[PDB]
Design a protein around this ligand. Structure first.
Ligand SMILES: O=C(O)C1=C[C@@H](O)[C@@H](O)[C@H](O)C1
Ligand SMILES: [Cl-]
Ligand SMILES: [Cl-]
Ligand SMILES: [Mg+2]
Ligand SMILES: [Mg+2]
Ligand SMILES: [Mg+2]
Length: 169
C-alpha cells in the first residue's frame, strides 16, 4: 500500500511534489490518471467526451481502489477522485496529504495547453473556484496531513512532508 496518497485540485502540485516526495522517501510515483489511460488504452479526454463523466468516475474509482491495494510508493489521485464516495471510503486508514492551493495560484498554474475537460475556457477562473468550493470539504474529510503549496518552493513543502510523516500527529 502507498506510503502516501496525494490529493488536491489541478495545479496543486501533485505531479511535482509527487516526484519530490517520492525521491525523498525513496520509492515510485503512480498517478491514477496515467493508470486509467494505461488500463483502458484511452485518453481521459476521450472518455469524458464520448462516454461521459459518470463512466469516467466509475473507472477511476476502480483504478484508485486497485492502486491503494497494489502500489507501495507515492500515489497521486486525479483531482476529482474524492467526489466518489467509494474513493473516500477506500482512503480510510491511509496517509493522505492534501495539497492546498488558492484559486489565483491554481488558475495560473493550470493555464497552459493541457487538455482539461472540467477546466477549459472561457471563464476558467470561475470554473476553478466552483471545483474548489465543492471539493474543499471532500479533500479535508479524507486528508491526514495538509500542506500549503501557495508560496513555498516545492522542495520546501516537501520538507513539511518528509518531516511530518515521521513524527507523531
Ligand atoms: O479535476 C478533475 O475532476 C479532473 C482532473 C484530472 O486529473 C483528470 O482526472 C480529469 O480530467 C478530471
Ligand atoms: Cl520521483
Ligand atoms: Cl472516481
Ligand atoms: Mg519538478
Ligand atoms: Mg490524456
Ligand atoms: Mg465502464
Amino acid at each position: 500500500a502507498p506510503k502516501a496518497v496525494l490529493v488536491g485540485l489541478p495545479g496543486s502540485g501533485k505531479s511535482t511534489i509527487g516526484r519530490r516526495l517520492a525521491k525523498a522517501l525513496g520509492v515510485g510515483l503512480l498517478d491514477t490518471d496515467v493508470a486509467i489511460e494505461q488500463r483502458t488504452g484511452r485518453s481521459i479526454a476521450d472518455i469524458f467526451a464520448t462516454d461521459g463523466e459518470q463512466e469516467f468516475r466509475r473507472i477511476e474509482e476502480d483504478v484508485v481502489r486497485a492502486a491503494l491495494a497494489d502500489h507501495d510508493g507515492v500515489l497521486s489521485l486525479g483531482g476529482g477522485a474524492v467526489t466518489s464516495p467509494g474513493v473516500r471510503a477506500a482512503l480510510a486508514g491511509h496517509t493522505v496529504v492534501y495539497l492546498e492551493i488558492s484559486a489565483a495560484e491554481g488558475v495560473r498554474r493550470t493555464g497552459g495547453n493541457t487538455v482539461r475537460p472540467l477546466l477549459a475556457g472561457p471563464d476558467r477562473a470561475e470554473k476553478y473556484r466552483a471545483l474548489m468550493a465543492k471539493r474543499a470539504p471532500l479533500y479535508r474529510r479524507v486528508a491526514t496531513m495538509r500542506v500549503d503549496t501557495n508560496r513555498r518552493n516545492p522542495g520546501a513543502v516537501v520538507r513539511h512532508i518528509l518531516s511530518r510523516l515521521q513524527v507523531p500527529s
